[PDB]
């Protein structure tokens, strides 16, 4: 499950490959346009809150 | 007498509620040299579909026929008779069409078998497109 991360203040964005279910428990069962603290996304991710803007499905 | 229906019956133009300390009635001449019957002026009935007292205008064709049945209410049926020429035999062939016509209650003495003059109008109902404009009594039938 790829993660498409965009930071509008600097206007920069990149794609992050993540494959660990333990790291994504914070995201599941959450609707779109909800704010989630991404502290469990890794060691570089503390103090970040990321809004979910919706992605694609396995079939696109 | 007149108010025999659920809604109040009146002519749409006459305002009958003027402050005072006989009802005036609307009527018109329909043209084409047709004389408005007297009992349409001193009468007391009302009718949307009466040519002399309602909002129907006479246009189109002016036809004639003979009365056949008078069982419907404020509408009768006349019968038009004519001949149809067939070229092969050089002969004619009697044909007839009978048609529904709205008889205003001003033409009050109408029997079976007299000649009426009908003028085309707005389509009044499913099968009625004509009003009676004058009635001529048949031969004899005066007594």
């Amino acid at each position: 499950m790829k993660l498409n991360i965009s930071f509008p203040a600097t206007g920069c964005q990149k794609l992050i490959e993540v494959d660990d279910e333990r790291k994504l428990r914070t995201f599941y069962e959450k609707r779109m346009a909800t704010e989630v603290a991404a502290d469990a996304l890794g060691e570089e991710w503390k103090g970040y809150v990321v809004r979910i803007s919706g992605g694609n499905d396995k079939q696109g | 007498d007149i108010q025999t229906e659920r809604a109040y019956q009146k002519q749409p133009t006459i305002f009958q509620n003027k402050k005072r300390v006989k009802l005036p009635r609307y009527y018109k001449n329909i043209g084409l040299g047709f004389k408005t019957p007297k009992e349409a002026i001193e009468g007391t009935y009302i009718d949307k579909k009466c040519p002399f007292t309602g909002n129907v205008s006479i246009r189109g064709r002016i036809l004639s026929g003979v009365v056949t049945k008078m069982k419907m209410q404020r509408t009768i049926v006349i019968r038009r008779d004519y001949l149809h020429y067939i070229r092969k035999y050089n002969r004619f062939e009697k044909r007839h069409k009978n048609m529904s016509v709205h008889l205003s209650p001003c033409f009050r003495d109408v029997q079976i078998g007299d000649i009426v003059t009908v003028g085309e109008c707005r389509p009044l109902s499913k099968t009625v497109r004509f009003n009676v404009l004058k009635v001529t009594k048949a031969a004899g039938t005066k007594k």
Binding site: - | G31, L32, G33, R59
Partner: protein
């Protein structure tokens, strides 16, 4: 069908355009305008088939899109603009003026006129009509609306309009004695003095009229277009003067003109 038509077959075109059969499948459909489709004459037909200033449809498009053609005092860039009775075609660059007038047959004839005659035109009124605040109106046969007319103008009169200002200069009252031109029917193009006015309530009134040779002919009132007091036209009449010569003496003058010409 499912909407308004936009084409016109040649064989279904009005006959007086004199369109042929083998040039094409389609005929120029007149654009919507002041004149009816069957009684008009598209600008395409006038320049390519009558005057022959062009040869094809593209050549006339170049002519009218250089703003050379001025119809009724206004510049028109529509190749299919419908020009009808009494319209003044004015091609200023070549120094030439026209007025569409029916000839003795059912056709629009080319009729060169002087520049002083091209400043005005006659037009039949169709309606008398009161505006929003008591302002009188009238409607001409070519769909002009003009306010505050002379109160003595009635529904069948004709008026003289100055094409620069569009205002009435003088009018002719419809009554017996006045000269007339027939714009429609089996007698169109004929000229005569109105003789009688027989009116049918509900139906169409008929007008009896006799030409300068004593021949009498009738027509419906909707085809009557008065063009002068007494027997003096207010316009210049074309060749033949609106006298329809029968087939018998048409050949008699055709060959006698031929043996006069050799």
């Amino acid at each position: 069908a499912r909407g308004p038509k936009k084409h016109l077959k040649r064989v279904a075109a009005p006959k007086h355009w004199m369109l042929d059969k083998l040039t094409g499948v389609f005929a120029p459909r007149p654009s919507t305008g002041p004149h009816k489709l069957r009684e008009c004459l598209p600008l395409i037909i006038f320049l390519r088939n009558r005057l022959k200033y062009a040869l094809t449809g593209d050549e006339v498009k170049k002519i009218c899109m250089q703003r050379f053609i001025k119809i009724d005092g206004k510049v028109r860039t529509d190749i299919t603009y419908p020009a009808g009775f009494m319209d003044v075609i004015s091609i200023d660059k070549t120094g030439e003026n026209f007025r569409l007038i029916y000839d003795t047959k059912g056709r629009f004839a080319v009729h060169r006129i002087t520049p002083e005659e091209a400043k005005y035109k006659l037009c039949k009124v169709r309606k008398i009509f009161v505006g929003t605040k008591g302002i009188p109106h009238l409607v001409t046969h070519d769909a002009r609306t003009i306010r505050y007319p002379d109160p003595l103008i009635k529904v069948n009169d004709t008026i003289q309009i100055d094409l620069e200002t569009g205002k009435i200069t003088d009018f002719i009252k419809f009554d017996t004695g006045n000269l007339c031109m027939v714009t429609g029917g089996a007698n169109l193009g004929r000229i005569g003095v109105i003789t009688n006015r027989e009116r049918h309530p509900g139906s169409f009134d008929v007008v009896h009229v006799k030409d300068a040779n004593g021949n009498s002919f009738a027509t419906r009132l909707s085809n009557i277009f008065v063009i002068g007091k007494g027997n003096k036209p207010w316009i210049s009449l074309p060749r033949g003067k609106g006298i329809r010569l029968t087939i018998a003496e048409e050949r008699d003058k055709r060959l006698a003109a031929k043996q006069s010409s050799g």
